[PDB]
Amino acid sequence: WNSDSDENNVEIVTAEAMTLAQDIASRRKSKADLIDEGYNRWSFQSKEGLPDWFLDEETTVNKPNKPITKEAVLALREKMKALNARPIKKVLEAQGRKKMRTIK
Amino acid sequence: VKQQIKNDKEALGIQAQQLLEEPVENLHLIRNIFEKFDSPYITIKKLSLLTLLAVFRDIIPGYKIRPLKEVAQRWEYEQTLLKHYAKFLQTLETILKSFTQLSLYQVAVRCCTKLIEQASHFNLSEKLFALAVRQISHKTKRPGFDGIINSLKNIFEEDNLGKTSLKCVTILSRMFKQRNYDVLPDVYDLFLSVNILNDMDLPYLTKKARKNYKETKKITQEMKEADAVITAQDKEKYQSEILKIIFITYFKTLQLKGKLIGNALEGVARLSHLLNIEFLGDLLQVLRELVMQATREALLTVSTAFEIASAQGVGKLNLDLDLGLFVQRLYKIIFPFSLNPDADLNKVVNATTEMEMLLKCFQVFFFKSKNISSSRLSSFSKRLAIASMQLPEHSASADLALLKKLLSRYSKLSRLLTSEEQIGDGIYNPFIEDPDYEPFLLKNHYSPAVSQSAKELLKS
Amino acid sequence: EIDAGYSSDSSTEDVAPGLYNLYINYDIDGKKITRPATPAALDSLIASIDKDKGWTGIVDPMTGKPVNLTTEELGLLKRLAQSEIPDENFDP
């Protein structure tokens, strides 16, 4: 009754994924249209089983460049904002040192 | 019988001594100790377990063994060593979960604590921590609980990097979900001990050796500078994740509104200054949303709200948030506190004994720079005297002593006073201004010393 | 005649949520719809502290609550953003 037996997930960290995720959630781009747009020249280049010397240079070079929207960029900055990113000291003395640098 | 036990103890001592002298060459002796532990005698089981603990702590490296003759045999040695250590731990959960036998369980807890204190950095620490916390997650204080919490507290203090603390915090959080955030109050105090959050002639060298020595020295200096920067960043990231897990546990505890609200507000007040500014403004909303032991809980909310506002530099960071709603809550809560009884017995913000926070909230209220004594303190103090009709005299003398040492020169507090606004329910006496009640009745009271306390007040 | 209808896959639809005041002004035929009460400040603080998996940060104009990707939407985003067939069982 105390067993720690505790799967697959995903972590949206790229601007590309956020723009796609925003389009899915905001319903601006229809989900059915997104699926159809996913049958392109790059999805048919399957990566299942390819070696690491091949896959590494395929990702750095042969990676389709999807657009990025400013709204998704803000969302990532919001996600990347840690709980202690701007505490009382890092907002007061950090602001104070810059102020006294400008004064000097 | 006794001779057999003595012979087995001697054999364990000889095997242990040989291991200390030559650890690498005698790995089979550890297997022999396990066979000796298999003896039915309880005392021999205890001695074998202790010798295994002593042997393991002596031969365990000070570094983390990196998994896979000068290098190969060392790897086989370390791989072989890990196998007994796993087997020894496997016996540990078996005997721990199996709970005469109580003494063996206490010994089992003891070696578990010793491994925690010393072998925290080593492999299988995830299993070691999980076994120990599983004993604490239970409703009742099992034997050795004081030893385990001390060991966990010591690790949190020494762990400057915060990786081991992060592992324990995650495991402690998992128990809280399993227990529905219903554990002993001492358990939540572990988070308070996280040091990461609380931090807020010469031998001759050949011509070739000198160039090697110089080359290594340059690497070490470059290694140190990069490590220092990496340590600062990793500690900062670990601190953020620890705050994430700790605060999410505290907020979940507040949502359930259990009996552990005391420790949750304790942690929230202690770690509030570590959190972001935007969260400070929204932190008081959850405190003020619980107004529909109800008086005791409201005391914690108003006291913690005072503590959060007490953070240095709030004047520069004008977050406002109008803590006056908490002020009026304290202004109204004194009457039910005077209504219900209270007993100190004999031998949660920061302490216990509810009367202690009240004076503590009053003294931080007084410690506020010019925030009071603007004819508002007197109105507050009047009901303070009214609420002082009961409770021990030392408490009664304490609150009267607060206004005695008060810098304000107002003297009409214990008599007719200016308008008693802010929820009223008392004599207003508007626009009176007369230097002319409660002490007269206070003189007649069970304890004789209240009479002289009233006399010393009117004379002073 | 062609009935001037809307097929279920038409790119035109009502209620287009956007990023972040709440756009609770009126409804069709012009009636104010009730504002859903603001969420418990505890619960809102929890969600802010630990963002839900697939936290899009998108609120529909009607309800002030955020819109979060479901498990199937998270899977579709996984396949689409990794440039694979968005169909789990399609023979390439």
Tab-separated table of C-alpha atoms in Angstrom, chain B residues 273-441:
chain	number	residue	atom	x	y	z
B	273	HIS	CA	11.434	35.367	-0.317
B	274	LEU	CA	12.968	32.774	-2.667
B	275	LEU	CA	10.053	32.937	-5.119
B	276	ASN	CA	9.386	35.363	-7.963
B	277	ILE	CA	7.902	38.809	-7.382
B	278	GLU	CA	4.771	38.061	-9.418
B	279	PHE	CA	4.034	35.104	-7.140
B	280	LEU	CA	4.261	37.317	-4.039
B	281	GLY	CA	1.186	39.261	-5.136
B	282	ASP	CA	-0.799	36.093	-5.797
B	283	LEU	CA	0.497	34.399	-2.630
B	284	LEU	CA	-1.772	36.448	-0.372
B	285	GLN	CA	-4.852	35.544	-2.434
B	286	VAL	CA	-4.716	31.902	-1.324
B	287	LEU	CA	-4.183	33.032	2.271
B	288	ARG	CA	-7.208	35.344	2.191
B	289	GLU	CA	-9.492	32.926	0.323
B	290	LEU	CA	-9.787	30.647	3.385
B	291	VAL	CA	-12.100	32.726	5.580
B	292	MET	CA	-15.327	30.775	5.101
B	293	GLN	CA	-9.508	25.139	14.648
B	294	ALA	CA	-10.864	27.732	12.216
B	295	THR	CA	-9.632	30.632	14.356
B	296	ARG	CA	-6.204	29.003	14.622
B	297	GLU	CA	-5.946	28.627	10.836
B	298	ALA	CA	-6.945	32.253	10.261
B	299	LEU	CA	-4.188	33.233	12.695
B	300	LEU	CA	-1.629	31.434	10.524
B	301	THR	CA	-2.858	33.132	7.346
B	302	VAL	CA	-2.688	36.649	8.793
B	303	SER	CA	0.680	36.002	10.456
B	304	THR	CA	2.218	34.577	7.278
B	305	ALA	CA	0.751	37.475	5.295
B	306	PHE	CA	2.533	39.817	7.702
B	307	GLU	CA	5.755	37.836	7.268
B	308	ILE	CA	5.544	37.952	3.463
B	309	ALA	CA	4.984	41.713	3.577
B	310	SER	CA	7.847	41.902	6.097
B	311	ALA	CA	10.322	40.970	3.345
B	312	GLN	CA	13.024	43.605	2.978
B	313	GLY	CA	12.763	46.047	0.099
B	314	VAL	CA	8.992	45.815	-0.407
B	315	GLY	CA	9.037	49.612	-0.393
B	316	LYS	CA	11.124	49.606	-3.566
B	317	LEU	CA	9.041	46.765	-5.054
B	318	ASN	CA	5.683	48.484	-4.587
B	319	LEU	CA	3.518	45.397	-4.996
B	320	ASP	CA	0.840	46.967	-2.725
B	321	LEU	CA	-1.780	44.124	-2.391
B	322	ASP	CA	-3.534	45.925	0.516
B	323	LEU	CA	-2.837	43.561	3.410
B	324	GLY	CA	-5.485	45.506	5.333
B	325	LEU	CA	-7.901	42.631	4.749
B	326	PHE	CA	-5.580	40.495	6.865
B	327	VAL	CA	-5.288	43.358	9.371
B	328	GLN	CA	-9.055	43.429	9.888
B	329	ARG	CA	-9.045	39.625	10.102
B	330	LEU	CA	-6.623	39.832	13.028
B	331	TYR	CA	-8.702	42.722	14.379
B	332	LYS	CA	-11.786	40.469	14.432
B	333	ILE	CA	-10.105	37.184	15.418
B	334	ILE	CA	-9.059	38.278	18.918
B	335	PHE	CA	-12.595	37.951	20.307
B	336	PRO	CA	-13.020	34.223	19.465
B	337	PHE	CA	-9.521	33.630	20.852
B	338	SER	CA	-10.639	35.224	24.114
B	339	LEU	CA	-13.809	33.112	23.983
B	340	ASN	CA	-12.223	29.682	23.613
B	341	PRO	CA	-10.016	28.188	26.353
B	342	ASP	CA	-6.277	27.593	26.096
B	343	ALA	CA	-3.933	25.490	28.238
B	344	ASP	CA	-0.132	25.539	28.115
B	345	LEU	CA	0.149	22.142	29.897
B	346	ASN	CA	3.834	21.772	30.946
B	347	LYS	CA	7.108	20.080	30.001
B	348	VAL	CA	2.860	27.272	12.487
B	349	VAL	CA	4.648	30.509	11.574
B	350	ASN	CA	7.745	29.830	13.678
B	351	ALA	CA	6.598	28.331	17.000
B	352	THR	CA	3.646	26.817	18.893
B	353	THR	CA	1.360	27.864	21.800
B	354	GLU	CA	-1.099	30.022	19.851
B	355	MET	CA	-0.789	32.950	22.278
B	356	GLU	CA	2.851	33.125	21.144
B	357	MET	CA	2.027	34.049	17.532
B	358	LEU	CA	-0.483	36.666	18.663
B	359	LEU	CA	2.215	38.591	20.519
B	360	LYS	CA	4.548	37.668	17.654
B	361	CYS	CA	2.138	39.175	15.126
B	362	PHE	CA	1.763	42.154	17.461
B	363	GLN	CA	5.528	42.632	17.792
B	364	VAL	CA	6.188	42.393	14.051
B	365	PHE	CA	3.259	44.801	13.730
B	366	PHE	CA	5.040	47.101	16.187
B	367	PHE	CA	8.374	46.500	14.438
B	368	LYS	CA	6.836	47.895	11.236
B	369	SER	CA	8.457	51.254	10.490
B	370	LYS	CA	5.874	53.934	11.377
B	371	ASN	CA	3.062	51.767	9.968
B	372	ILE	CA	1.141	52.071	13.264
B	373	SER	CA	0.697	54.406	16.261
B	374	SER	CA	-1.347	56.725	14.003
B	375	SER	CA	-4.407	56.444	16.327
B	376	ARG	CA	-4.971	52.975	14.813
B	377	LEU	CA	-2.835	51.125	17.374
B	378	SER	CA	-4.959	52.456	20.238
B	379	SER	CA	-8.146	51.153	18.613
B	380	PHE	CA	-6.452	47.777	18.150
B	381	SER	CA	-5.099	47.805	21.707
B	382	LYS	CA	-8.516	48.481	23.258
B	383	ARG	CA	-9.930	45.130	22.147
B	384	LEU	CA	-6.556	43.643	23.098
B	385	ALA	CA	-7.311	44.685	26.678
B	386	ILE	CA	-10.876	43.389	26.282
B	387	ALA	CA	-9.521	40.049	25.067
B	388	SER	CA	-7.116	40.100	28.073
B	389	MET	CA	-9.987	39.390	30.490
B	390	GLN	CA	-8.891	35.721	30.599
B	391	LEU	CA	-5.692	33.715	29.799
B	392	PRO	CA	-2.607	33.359	32.057
B	393	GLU	CA	-1.310	36.561	33.628
B	394	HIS	CA	2.111	36.159	32.000
B	395	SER	CA	0.271	36.349	28.678
B	396	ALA	CA	-1.824	39.253	29.974
B	397	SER	CA	1.287	41.041	31.251
B	398	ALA	CA	2.991	40.410	27.903
B	399	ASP	CA	0.430	42.203	25.722
B	400	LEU	CA	0.216	45.067	28.218
B	401	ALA	CA	4.022	45.145	28.165
B	402	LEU	CA	3.925	45.632	24.382
B	403	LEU	CA	2.128	48.956	24.805
B	404	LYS	CA	4.316	49.713	27.838
B	405	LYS	CA	7.467	49.641	25.694
B	406	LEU	CA	5.564	51.210	22.780
B	407	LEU	CA	7.193	54.347	21.390
B	408	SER	CA	3.779	56.014	21.042
B	409	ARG	CA	2.834	58.368	23.875
B	410	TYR	CA	-0.918	57.712	23.671
B	411	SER	CA	-2.314	56.886	27.121
B	412	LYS	CA	-6.089	56.598	26.558
B	413	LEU	CA	-5.846	53.038	25.198
B	414	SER	CA	-6.977	51.398	28.446
B	415	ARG	CA	-9.776	53.972	28.860
B	416	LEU	CA	-12.209	55.942	26.693
B	417	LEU	CA	-10.741	56.103	23.201
B	418	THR	CA	-11.234	57.524	19.714
B	419	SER	CA	-13.731	56.038	17.267
B	420	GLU	CA	-13.415	52.253	17.133
B	421	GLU	CA	-14.013	51.827	13.410
B	422	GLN	CA	-12.964	48.839	11.259
B	423	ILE	CA	-15.809	46.381	12.053
B	424	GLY	CA	-16.767	48.354	15.160
B	425	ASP	CA	-18.577	46.150	17.701
B	426	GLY	CA	-17.262	48.344	20.500
B	427	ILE	CA	-17.562	51.707	22.186
B	428	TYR	CA	-16.619	54.314	19.592
B	429	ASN	CA	-16.670	57.430	21.798
B	430	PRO	CA	-16.113	59.735	18.799
B	431	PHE	CA	-14.400	63.101	19.285
B	432	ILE	CA	-13.793	62.908	23.042
B	433	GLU	CA	-10.104	63.718	23.741
B	434	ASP	CA	-10.208	63.062	27.486
B	435	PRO	CA	-7.128	61.755	29.361
B	436	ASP	CA	-9.341	59.664	31.690
B	437	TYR	CA	-11.906	50.743	32.639
B	438	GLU	CA	-10.674	47.187	32.127
B	439	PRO	CA	-7.850	47.284	34.753
B	440	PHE	CA	-10.391	48.050	37.494
B	441	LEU	CA	-12.074	44.680	36.952
